Short mmCIF file of C-alpha atoms and ligand atoms in Angstrom, two decimals:
data_model
loop_
_atom_site.label_atom_id
_atom_site.label_comp_id
_atom_site.label_asym_id
_atom_site.label_seq_id
_atom_site.Cartn_x
_atom_site.Cartn_y
_atom_site.Cartn_z
CA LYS A 1 -34.28 11.88 102.28
CA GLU A 2 -36.75 11.86 99.72
CA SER A 3 -37.24 8.32 97.74
CA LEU A 4 -38.81 6.96 94.71
CA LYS A 5 -42.38 5.59 96.52
CA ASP A 6 -42.23 9.20 98.46
CA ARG A 7 -42.06 11.18 95.36
CA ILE A 8 -44.79 8.74 93.69
CA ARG A 9 -46.99 9.75 97.18
CA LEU A 10 -45.68 13.59 96.64
CA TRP A 11 -47.17 13.76 93.09
CA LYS A 12 -50.64 12.20 94.15
CA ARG A 13 -50.79 14.94 96.53
CA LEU A 14 -50.02 17.94 94.23
CA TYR A 15 -52.45 16.17 91.51
CA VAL A 16 -55.20 16.13 94.04
CA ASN A 17 -54.53 19.56 94.90
CA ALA A 18 -54.33 21.11 91.61
CA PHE A 19 -57.59 19.63 90.67
CA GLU A 20 -59.12 21.39 93.66
CA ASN A 21 -57.47 24.72 92.66
CA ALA A 22 -58.50 24.44 88.90
CA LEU A 23 -61.94 23.80 89.96
CA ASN A 24 -62.22 26.77 92.01
CA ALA A 25 -60.57 29.00 89.58
CA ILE A 26 -62.38 27.99 86.63
CA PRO A 27 -65.73 29.79 87.19
CA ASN A 28 -63.39 33.36 87.10
CA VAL A 29 -62.62 33.21 83.49
CA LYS A 30 -65.09 35.45 81.67
CA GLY A 31 -65.25 34.14 78.03
CA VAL A 32 -62.74 32.49 75.55
CA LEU A 33 -62.47 33.13 72.30
CA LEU A 34 -61.55 30.05 69.88
CA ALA A 35 -60.90 30.04 66.34
CA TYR A 36 -60.81 29.13 63.27
CA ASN A 37 -60.90 25.27 62.97
CA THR A 38 -64.57 23.37 63.84
CA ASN A 39 -65.76 20.44 61.66
CA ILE A 40 -67.01 17.26 62.04
CA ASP A 41 -65.23 13.81 63.36
CA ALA A 42 -66.43 10.45 61.80
CA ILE A 43 -64.82 7.79 64.24
CA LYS A 44 -64.34 4.54 62.91
CA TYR A 45 -62.90 1.76 65.10
CA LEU A 46 -60.83 -0.42 62.88
CA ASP A 47 -61.51 -3.97 62.18
CA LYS A 48 -58.70 -6.53 61.25
CA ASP A 49 -61.44 -8.42 58.85
CA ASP A 50 -62.58 -5.37 57.36
CA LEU A 51 -59.71 -3.74 56.74
CA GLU A 52 -57.90 -6.50 55.28
CA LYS A 53 -61.22 -7.50 52.65
CA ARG A 54 -61.16 -3.74 51.54
CA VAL A 55 -57.19 -3.92 50.68
CA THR A 56 -57.60 -6.88 48.88
CA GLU A 57 -60.62 -5.76 47.17
CA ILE A 58 -58.95 -2.68 45.74
CA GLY A 59 -55.54 -4.55 44.94
CA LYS A 60 -53.05 -5.62 48.11
CA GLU A 61 -50.17 -4.84 45.96
CA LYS A 62 -50.75 -1.01 45.12
CA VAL A 63 -51.94 -0.83 48.17
CA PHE A 64 -48.56 -1.91 49.89
CA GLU A 65 -46.20 -0.07 47.58
CA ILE A 66 -48.26 3.03 48.57
CA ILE A 67 -47.36 2.31 52.61
CA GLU A 68 -43.46 3.17 51.12
CA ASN A 69 -44.27 5.80 48.74
CA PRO A 70 -46.40 7.86 50.68
CA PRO A 71 -48.22 10.72 48.60
CA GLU A 72 -48.89 14.27 50.02
CA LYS A 73 -52.55 13.67 49.71
CA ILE A 74 -55.71 10.82 48.83
CA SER A 75 -56.30 10.61 45.52
CA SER A 76 -57.71 7.24 45.23
CA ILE A 77 -58.87 4.43 47.71
CA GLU A 78 -55.05 2.76 47.43
CA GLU A 79 -53.59 5.65 48.68
CA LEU A 80 -56.44 6.15 51.39
CA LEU A 81 -55.79 2.59 52.54
CA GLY A 82 -52.05 2.71 51.87
CA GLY A 83 -52.20 5.77 54.51
CA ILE A 84 -54.17 3.98 57.15
CA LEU A 85 -51.44 0.84 56.99
CA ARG A 86 -48.99 2.91 56.81
CA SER A 87 -50.01 5.01 59.63
CA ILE A 88 -50.55 1.56 62.07
CA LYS A 89 -46.87 0.16 60.59
CA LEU A 90 -45.19 3.54 61.95
CA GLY A 91 -47.86 3.92 64.89
CA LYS A 92 -48.24 7.39 64.00
CA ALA A 93 -50.80 10.20 64.03
CA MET A 94 -51.25 11.25 60.59
CA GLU A 95 -53.78 13.19 58.11
CA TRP A 96 -54.24 13.49 54.82
CA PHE A 97 -56.06 15.81 52.80
CA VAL A 98 -58.82 14.03 50.13
CA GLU A 99 -59.01 15.64 46.72
CA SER A 100 -60.78 12.90 45.02
CA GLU A 101 -64.64 12.82 44.89
CA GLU A 102 -64.79 9.05 44.57
CA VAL A 103 -62.76 8.75 47.80
CA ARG A 104 -65.21 11.05 49.57
CA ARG A 105 -68.22 8.68 48.30
CA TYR A 106 -66.00 5.76 49.52
CA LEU A 107 -65.39 7.05 52.85
CA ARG A 108 -68.80 8.02 53.40
CA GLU A 109 -70.11 4.40 52.37
CA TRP A 110 -67.31 2.75 54.93
CA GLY A 111 -69.17 4.78 57.36
CA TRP A 112 -68.15 5.50 60.94
CA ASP A 113 -68.98 4.26 64.62
CA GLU A 114 -68.87 7.76 66.44
CA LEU A 115 -69.79 10.92 65.44
CA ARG A 116 -68.07 13.81 67.55
CA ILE A 117 -67.18 17.66 67.50
CA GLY A 118 -63.66 17.97 65.24
CA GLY A 119 -61.38 20.57 64.78
CA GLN A 120 -59.08 22.20 67.34
CA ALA A 121 -61.52 24.92 68.05
CA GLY A 122 -64.35 22.99 67.74
CA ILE A 123 -63.17 20.35 70.47
CA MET A 124 -61.60 23.14 72.58
CA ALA A 125 -64.97 24.51 72.23
CA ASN A 126 -66.99 21.37 73.97
CA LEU A 127 -64.46 21.41 76.38
CA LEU A 128 -64.19 24.77 77.78
CA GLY A 129 -68.07 25.62 77.28
CA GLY A 130 -69.34 22.17 77.82
CA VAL A 131 -67.28 20.44 80.92
CA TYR A 132 -65.69 23.77 82.12
CA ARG A 133 -68.77 26.27 81.72
CA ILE A 134 -66.24 28.92 80.75
CA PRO A 135 -68.64 31.10 78.28
CA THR A 136 -67.31 30.25 74.81
CA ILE A 137 -67.41 31.69 71.71
CA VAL A 138 -66.32 29.89 68.89
CA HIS A 139 -65.50 30.13 64.92
CA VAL A 140 -67.96 27.73 62.77
CA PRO A 141 -67.13 27.93 59.20
CA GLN A 142 -70.31 25.25 58.16
CA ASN A 143 -72.84 25.16 60.42
CA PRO A 144 -75.62 22.46 59.40
CA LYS A 145 -77.48 20.45 61.76
CA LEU A 146 -75.48 17.90 62.01
CA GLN A 147 -72.52 20.24 62.78
CA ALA A 148 -74.48 22.19 65.29
CA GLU A 149 -75.75 19.58 67.51
CA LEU A 150 -72.33 18.00 68.27
CA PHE A 151 -71.92 21.23 70.72
CA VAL A 152 -73.07 19.96 74.01
CA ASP A 153 -75.15 21.95 76.15
CA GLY A 154 -73.82 24.72 77.81
CA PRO A 155 -72.19 28.42 77.15
CA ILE A 156 -71.14 27.75 74.10
CA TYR A 157 -71.91 30.43 71.63
CA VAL A 158 -71.40 31.67 67.48
CA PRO A 159 -71.32 35.27 66.64
CA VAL A 160 -74.48 36.45 64.60
CA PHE A 161 -75.34 39.88 62.70
CA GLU A 162 -78.71 40.58 63.25
CA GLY A 163 -79.06 44.46 61.91
CA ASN A 164 -75.45 46.48 62.98
CA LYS A 165 -76.24 44.31 66.28
CA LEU A 166 -74.02 41.17 66.77
CA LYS A 167 -75.67 38.22 68.70
CA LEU A 168 -74.41 35.42 70.56
CA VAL A 169 -76.15 32.60 70.07
CA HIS A 170 -75.93 28.53 70.54
CA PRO A 171 -74.93 26.77 67.93
CA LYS A 172 -78.07 24.77 67.67
CA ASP A 173 -79.65 28.08 67.16
CA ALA A 174 -77.83 29.06 64.10
CA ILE A 175 -77.73 26.23 61.55
CA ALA A 176 -77.92 27.35 57.84
CA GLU A 177 -78.07 25.08 55.08
CA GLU A 178 -74.38 24.48 54.64
CA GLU A 179 -71.65 21.74 54.38
CA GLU A 180 -70.75 19.44 56.33
CA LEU A 181 -67.00 19.19 56.85
CA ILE A 182 -66.13 15.87 57.74
CA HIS A 183 -62.81 14.42 59.04
CA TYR A 184 -62.83 10.41 58.53
CA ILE A 185 -60.65 8.92 61.60
CA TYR A 186 -59.38 5.78 62.22
CA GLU A 187 -58.70 4.72 65.39
CA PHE A 188 -56.22 1.45 66.23
CA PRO A 189 -55.06 -0.17 69.43
CA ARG A 190 -51.94 -0.88 70.89
CA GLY A 191 -50.98 -4.31 68.87
CA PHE A 192 -53.57 -3.77 66.15
CA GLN A 193 -52.67 -6.25 63.19
CA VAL A 194 -53.27 -6.07 59.74
CA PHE A 195 -51.89 -8.84 57.41
CA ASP A 196 -48.18 -8.48 58.61
CA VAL A 197 -48.44 -5.16 59.57
CA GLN A 198 -48.40 -4.69 63.59
CA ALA A 199 -49.16 -1.19 65.36
CA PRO A 200 -46.54 -0.49 68.15
CA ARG A 201 -48.35 2.31 69.77
CA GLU A 202 -52.18 3.36 69.62
CA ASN A 203 -52.73 6.06 66.94
CA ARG A 204 -55.41 7.41 64.02
CA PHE A 205 -55.25 8.16 60.70
CA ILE A 206 -57.42 11.00 59.36
CA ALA A 207 -58.58 11.11 55.94
CA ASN A 208 -59.50 15.02 56.09
CA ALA A 209 -62.37 15.24 53.42
CA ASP A 210 -62.93 19.24 54.66
CA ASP A 211 -62.45 21.88 52.18
CA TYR A 212 -62.75 25.04 54.23
CA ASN A 213 -60.57 24.47 56.92
CA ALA A 214 -58.27 23.74 54.08
CA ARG A 215 -58.08 27.18 53.39
CA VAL A 216 -59.19 28.83 56.89
CA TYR A 217 -62.38 30.32 55.45
CA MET A 218 -63.86 32.56 58.01
CA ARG A 219 -67.38 33.86 58.98
CA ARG A 220 -68.45 37.41 58.05
CA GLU A 221 -68.59 38.05 61.89
CA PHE A 222 -65.19 37.43 62.32
CA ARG A 223 -64.03 39.59 59.15
CA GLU A 224 -66.24 42.42 59.81
CA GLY A 225 -67.31 41.98 63.60
CA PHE A 226 -63.72 40.76 65.48
CA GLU A 227 -63.84 44.15 67.66
CA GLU A 228 -67.40 43.64 69.31
CA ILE A 229 -66.43 39.51 69.33
CA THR A 230 -63.37 40.65 71.31
CA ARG A 231 -65.01 42.66 73.69
CA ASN A 232 -66.95 39.72 75.27
CA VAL A 233 -64.09 37.53 76.00
CA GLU A 234 -60.09 37.49 78.36
CA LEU A 235 -58.89 34.72 76.50
CA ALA A 236 -58.30 33.47 72.92
CA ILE A 237 -57.10 30.35 71.26
CA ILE A 238 -55.73 30.21 68.01
CA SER A 239 -55.33 27.31 66.07
CA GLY A 240 -55.56 25.93 62.77
CA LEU A 241 -53.22 27.86 60.24
CA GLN A 242 -51.06 24.70 59.78
CA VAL A 243 -52.91 23.82 56.39
CA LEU A 244 -51.58 27.24 54.41
CA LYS A 245 -49.59 26.50 51.64
CA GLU A 246 -47.22 29.32 50.22
CA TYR A 247 -49.04 29.27 46.87
CA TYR A 248 -52.58 27.89 45.47
CA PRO A 249 -53.39 27.05 42.02
CA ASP A 250 -55.87 29.99 42.06
CA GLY A 251 -54.01 32.15 42.53
CA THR A 252 -54.25 33.66 46.02
CA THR A 253 -51.46 32.90 48.47
CA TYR A 254 -51.00 32.25 52.43
CA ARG A 255 -50.75 36.00 53.10
CA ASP A 256 -54.54 36.43 52.31
CA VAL A 257 -55.04 34.75 55.71
CA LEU A 258 -52.19 35.89 57.57
CA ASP A 259 -52.93 39.53 57.01
CA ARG A 260 -56.32 38.73 58.45
CA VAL A 261 -55.02 37.01 61.75
CA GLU A 262 -52.48 39.57 62.03
CA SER A 263 -55.47 42.24 62.46
CA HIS A 264 -57.23 39.65 65.10
CA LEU A 265 -54.13 39.61 67.15
CA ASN A 266 -53.86 43.58 66.56
CA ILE A 267 -57.55 43.70 68.18
CA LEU A 268 -57.14 41.12 70.92
CA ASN A 269 -54.16 43.05 72.27
CA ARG A 270 -55.84 46.44 72.28
CA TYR A 271 -58.02 44.83 74.61
CA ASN A 272 -54.99 42.94 76.70
CA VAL A 273 -57.03 39.53 75.89
CA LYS A 274 -54.44 36.76 76.54
CA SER A 275 -53.85 34.65 73.38
CA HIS A 276 -52.46 31.16 72.86
CA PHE A 277 -51.24 29.75 69.60
CA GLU A 278 -51.18 26.16 68.50
CA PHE A 279 -48.65 25.74 66.59
CA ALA A 280 -49.42 22.64 64.79
CA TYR A 281 -46.72 21.22 62.80
CA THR A 282 -46.91 23.31 59.41
CA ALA A 283 -45.15 21.54 56.18
CA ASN A 284 -44.36 24.50 54.37
CA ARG A 285 -41.51 26.24 55.21
CA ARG A 286 -42.37 29.81 54.19
CA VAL A 287 -45.58 29.55 56.11
CA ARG A 288 -44.10 28.37 59.25
CA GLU A 289 -41.54 31.57 59.38
CA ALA A 290 -44.42 33.60 59.02
CA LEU A 291 -46.03 31.60 61.88
CA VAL A 292 -42.68 32.45 63.91
CA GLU A 293 -42.51 36.22 62.73
CA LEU A 294 -46.24 36.49 64.25
CA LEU A 295 -45.75 34.36 67.89
CA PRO A 296 -44.49 37.92 69.67
CA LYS A 297 -48.04 39.13 68.93
CA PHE A 298 -49.34 36.39 70.85
CA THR A 299 -49.29 36.00 74.79
CA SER A 300 -48.42 31.88 75.01
CA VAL A 301 -47.86 29.09 72.25
CA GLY A 302 -48.32 25.40 72.84
CA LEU A 303 -46.12 22.81 70.83
CA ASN A 304 -44.71 19.29 71.28
CA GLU A 305 -41.43 17.96 69.92
CA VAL A 306 -41.63 17.67 66.09
CA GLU A 307 -43.27 21.49 66.46
CA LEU A 308 -40.35 22.73 68.79
CA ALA A 309 -37.90 20.89 66.62
CA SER A 310 -39.51 22.29 63.65
CA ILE A 311 -39.32 25.81 64.76
CA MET A 312 -35.77 25.40 66.10
CA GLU A 313 -34.86 23.92 62.13
CA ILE A 314 -35.80 27.59 60.53
CA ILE A 315 -34.22 29.73 63.06
CA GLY A 316 -30.97 28.08 61.94
CA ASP A 317 -30.53 25.74 65.17
CA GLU A 318 -30.26 22.04 63.54
CA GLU A 319 -27.80 20.75 66.49
CA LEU A 320 -30.36 21.78 68.66
CA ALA A 321 -33.26 20.76 66.71
CA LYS A 322 -32.21 17.25 65.93
CA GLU A 323 -31.64 16.74 69.78
CA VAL A 324 -35.20 18.09 70.37
CA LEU A 325 -36.29 15.55 68.13
CA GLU A 326 -34.61 12.89 69.78
CA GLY A 327 -36.27 13.37 73.28
CA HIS A 328 -33.55 14.93 75.19
CA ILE A 329 -35.32 17.15 78.08
CA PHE A 330 -32.62 19.64 78.36
CA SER A 331 -32.39 20.28 74.96
CA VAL A 332 -36.50 21.01 75.04
CA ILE A 333 -35.36 23.13 77.41
CA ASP A 334 -32.96 25.00 75.71
CA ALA A 335 -34.99 25.41 72.73
CA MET A 336 -38.05 26.96 74.74
CA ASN A 337 -35.28 29.51 75.90
CA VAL A 338 -33.96 30.34 72.47
CA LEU A 339 -37.72 30.55 71.26
CA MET A 340 -38.54 32.78 73.71
CA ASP A 341 -35.10 34.83 73.37
CA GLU A 342 -36.28 35.16 69.66
CA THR A 343 -39.82 36.12 70.39
CA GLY A 344 -40.25 37.76 73.65
CA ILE A 345 -43.48 35.63 74.32
CA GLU A 346 -44.49 35.48 77.70
CA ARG A 347 -45.33 32.07 77.87
CA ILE A 348 -44.28 28.55 76.07
CA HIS A 349 -46.04 24.83 76.92
CA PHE A 350 -44.33 22.31 75.85
CA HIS A 351 -46.07 18.51 75.62
CA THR A 352 -45.02 15.07 75.07
CA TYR A 353 -45.37 11.40 75.81
CA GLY A 354 -44.94 11.46 79.55
CA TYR A 355 -44.32 14.85 80.83
CA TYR A 356 -44.97 18.49 80.15
CA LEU A 357 -43.12 21.70 80.51
CA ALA A 358 -44.27 25.56 80.62
CA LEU A 359 -41.36 28.40 80.61
CA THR A 360 -42.94 31.93 81.82
CA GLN A 361 -41.78 35.27 82.24
CA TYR A 362 -43.79 35.57 85.27
CA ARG A 363 -44.04 33.37 88.22
CA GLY A 364 -46.21 31.29 90.44
CA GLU A 365 -47.20 27.35 91.12
CA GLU A 366 -50.04 28.34 89.26
CA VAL A 367 -48.34 27.40 86.31
CA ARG A 368 -47.54 23.91 87.60
CA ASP A 369 -51.21 23.38 88.88
CA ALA A 370 -52.23 23.79 85.64
CA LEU A 371 -50.22 21.46 83.77
CA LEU A 372 -51.48 19.32 86.57
CA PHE A 373 -55.04 20.09 85.83
CA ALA A 374 -54.36 19.31 81.70
CA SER A 375 -52.56 16.09 82.66
CA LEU A 376 -55.52 14.99 84.13
CA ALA A 377 -58.21 16.18 81.20
CA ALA A 378 -55.87 14.85 78.69
CA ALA A 379 -55.83 11.18 80.73
CA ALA A 380 -59.40 11.34 81.33
CA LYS A 381 -60.25 12.37 77.38
CA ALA A 382 -58.14 9.17 76.60
CA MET A 383 -60.14 6.87 79.09
CA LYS A 384 -63.76 8.23 77.94
CA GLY A 385 -63.08 8.89 74.77
CA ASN A 386 -65.42 12.08 75.20
CA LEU A 387 -65.93 14.11 77.96
CA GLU A 388 -68.98 15.68 79.38
CA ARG A 389 -68.60 16.58 83.48
CA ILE A 390 -66.03 18.13 84.98
CA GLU A 391 -66.43 15.27 87.91
CA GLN A 392 -65.02 12.74 84.76
CA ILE A 393 -61.75 14.48 85.54
CA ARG A 394 -61.70 13.37 88.86
CA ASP A 395 -61.72 9.78 87.50
CA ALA A 396 -57.99 10.27 86.10
CA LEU A 397 -56.75 10.63 89.55
CA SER A 398 -56.39 7.09 89.76
CA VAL A 399 -54.38 6.46 86.68
CA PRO A 400 -50.56 6.27 87.54
CA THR A 401 -48.24 8.69 87.10
CA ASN A 402 -45.64 7.88 84.80
CA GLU A 403 -42.87 6.73 86.58
CA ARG A 404 -40.00 7.51 84.23
CA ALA A 405 -40.62 11.26 84.44
CA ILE A 406 -41.34 11.34 87.97
CA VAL A 407 -37.37 9.81 87.88
CA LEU A 408 -36.36 12.37 85.20
CA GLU A 409 -37.15 15.09 87.31
CA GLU A 410 -34.17 14.25 89.51
CA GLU A 411 -31.89 15.60 86.79
CA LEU A 412 -33.96 18.70 86.88
CA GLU A 413 -32.99 19.02 90.30
CA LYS A 414 -29.70 18.60 89.79
CA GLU A 415 -29.25 21.00 86.69
CA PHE A 416 -31.37 23.54 87.75
CA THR A 417 -32.35 24.98 91.23
CA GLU A 418 -36.02 23.88 92.01
CA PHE A 419 -37.61 25.98 94.95
CA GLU A 420 -40.87 23.56 94.92
CA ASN A 421 -41.60 20.49 93.55
CA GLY A 422 -41.94 20.80 89.34
CA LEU A 423 -40.73 24.54 89.95
CA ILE A 424 -37.71 26.04 88.57
CA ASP A 425 -36.42 29.39 88.95
CA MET A 426 -34.49 31.32 86.25
CA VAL A 427 -33.02 34.85 86.25
CA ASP A 428 -36.20 36.13 84.16
CA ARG A 429 -37.97 32.91 83.45
CA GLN A 430 -39.99 30.25 85.51
CA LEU A 431 -39.58 26.92 84.23
CA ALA A 432 -43.04 24.14 85.59
CA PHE A 433 -42.52 20.69 84.89
CA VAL A 434 -44.87 17.73 85.44
CA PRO A 435 -45.28 13.87 85.05
CA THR A 436 -48.22 13.09 83.44
CA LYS A 437 -50.48 10.65 83.33
CA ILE A 438 -50.62 8.06 80.53
CA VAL A 439 -53.73 5.64 79.97
CA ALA A 440 -52.54 2.45 78.81
CA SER A 441 -55.44 1.36 76.95
CA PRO A 442 -57.17 4.66 75.50
CA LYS A 443 -60.78 4.46 74.10
CA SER A 444 -59.63 7.32 71.74
CA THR A 445 -56.45 9.09 70.58
CA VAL A 446 -57.99 12.33 68.64
CA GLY A 447 -58.09 15.46 70.61
CA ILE A 448 -55.58 14.84 73.52
CA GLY A 449 -53.44 17.77 72.61
CA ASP A 450 -56.36 20.39 72.31
CA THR A 451 -57.32 19.02 75.70
CA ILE A 452 -53.62 19.72 76.91
CA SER A 453 -53.32 23.13 76.05
CA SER A 454 -56.37 24.82 76.42
CA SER A 455 -56.79 23.11 79.82
CA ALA A 456 -53.54 24.79 81.33
CA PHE A 457 -54.04 27.49 79.24
CA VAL A 458 -57.54 28.52 80.85
CA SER A 459 -57.20 27.33 84.40
CA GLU A 460 -53.75 29.11 84.32
CA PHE A 461 -55.44 32.15 84.13
CA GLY A 462 -58.34 31.84 85.95
CA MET A 463 -55.86 30.56 88.96
CA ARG A 464 -53.75 33.61 88.58
CA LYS A 465 -56.45 36.12 88.74
CA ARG A 466 -56.10 38.29 92.13
N1 AMP B 501 -52.73 7.34 75.92
C1 AMP B 501 -52.15 8.83 76.08
N2 AMP B 501 -52.88 8.88 77.76
C2 AMP B 501 -52.68 10.37 77.77
N3 AMP B 501 -52.26 11.29 77.18
C3 AMP B 501 -51.71 10.91 75.95
C4 AMP B 501 -52.15 9.59 75.09
N4 AMP B 501 -51.69 9.48 74.15
C5 AMP B 501 -51.17 11.29 73.83
N5 AMP B 501 -51.40 11.86 75.08
C6 AMP B 501 -50.95 12.83 74.90
O1 AMP B 501 -51.43 13.76 74.04
C7 AMP B 501 -50.45 14.20 73.03
C8 AMP B 501 -50.56 14.20 72.07
O2 AMP B 501 -50.73 16.08 71.17
P1 AMP B 501 -50.22 15.92 69.86
O3 AMP B 501 -48.94 14.83 69.55
O4 AMP B 501 -49.37 17.16 69.95
O5 AMP B 501 -51.31 16.21 69.07
C9 AMP B 501 -49.20 13.96 73.71
O6 AMP B 501 -47.76 14.56 73.32
C10 AMP B 501 -49.58 13.39 75.07
O7 AMP B 501 -48.82 14.28 75.96
O1 GLC B 502 -57.53 17.61 67.37
C1 GLC B 502 -57.90 16.86 66.38
C2 GLC B 502 -58.42 17.73 65.30
O2 GLC B 502 -56.98 17.58 64.39
C3 GLC B 502 -57.32 18.36 62.97
O3 GLC B 502 -57.57 19.74 63.01
C4 GLC B 502 -57.78 17.17 62.47
O4 GLC B 502 -57.82 17.47 61.31
C5 GLC B 502 -59.26 17.19 62.77
O5 GLC B 502 -60.20 16.44 62.53
C6 GLC B 502 -59.33 16.92 64.33
O6 GLC B 502 -60.78 16.98 65.12
#
């Protein structure tokens, strides 16, 4: 007989092993490409007193109206503060684009407490190159001194044309007189309260003041030299495409970018580079559909509940979509299988609060251990806010494993086989499952997702190398 306390012990043991497995496998990974979104994250830790004053100055009325009538993008200070309060009320990760110049000035005056690398590729770069020491090539749309220096020391590189020769240099050695792409990040803890609104869960509002990543502008090197860049890596992780709109007022379309991305995938595939897509929520239906059609060209995809559900919705499975959005684990599993049926993709990594899943056409415990590694990395990132040394991830071993997910696994054993803890066989697929490590009082919430997907993908690959 295997009880709950025994199960708690068993996961502690598998967590410890996995961390060791990952450590030994990571040095095998010979290069990762990361694209396309890199920016600056300007982090403010909200203050009740300060926030209230600001709302009050601009007009509390208008601000409170905006909480109920949320715009699509920020065009005034009211809509900014409305967006922030809304984010607090709903305890929700939100991000709105800042079109207004006057607001950008307001954002910069209001300032920040901490400056960190930003964007999905950027955050992943610091982690993979700086913490894991995997040689990393990263797309950086604009590289002024302030941008470049947020990169930690290590094998992090940007491609640069010198003659016909393409060189790989550290970002601090490719500084140009270009734009600061600032994302303003407003973190709040569980129970944060402003006026009569209290936060149910810890989250952040992001006021996105970044005109380049908005349209996915690519550097010369990536447009003209993608092939030479590709010869340098074994892995690629692609993100940032969720921003794309079907139409722009300037007559351009999403197709301009996706045709380009598809060429990249064709090149990646010609070199047998394994690629992972972060399929962030894509508001534009037509674009979401186009992204789904690209999925067969990727090796792997990462997603959460609303992402999985939004995908189910466009292939015409609304019953399943609603159930995924309701958090029903067996519905999540069916959605992953449907997605794999639709696309033939090798790997789907799903993450939510308390547990991860990975569905794969291939087999092995490496899939599970990578989920476990990533779970620790996520926990460590939440504790420390920003990661710097792989040994800091060892600290996450003492964060308790989510007890609800441990119990949930009993349900998985009854429904599916389970040949090993957290490991399920299907006829031509394997399903890995992991109870995660939820940090009660996190230092920051930005970048946790990035840490999850990239950590599982790269450590899995490393561990699977024969
Ligand atoms: N306090 C926390 N501790 C550990 N993991 C977290 C915490 N908050 C969020 N996460 C993880 O980070 C993910 C956020 O990913 P996403 O919502 O896809 O950007 C969640 O799905 C969780 O798995
Ligand atoms: O993953 C966190 C990142 O997600 C999004 O790209 C945000 O716009 C960016 O500010 C943040 O750096």
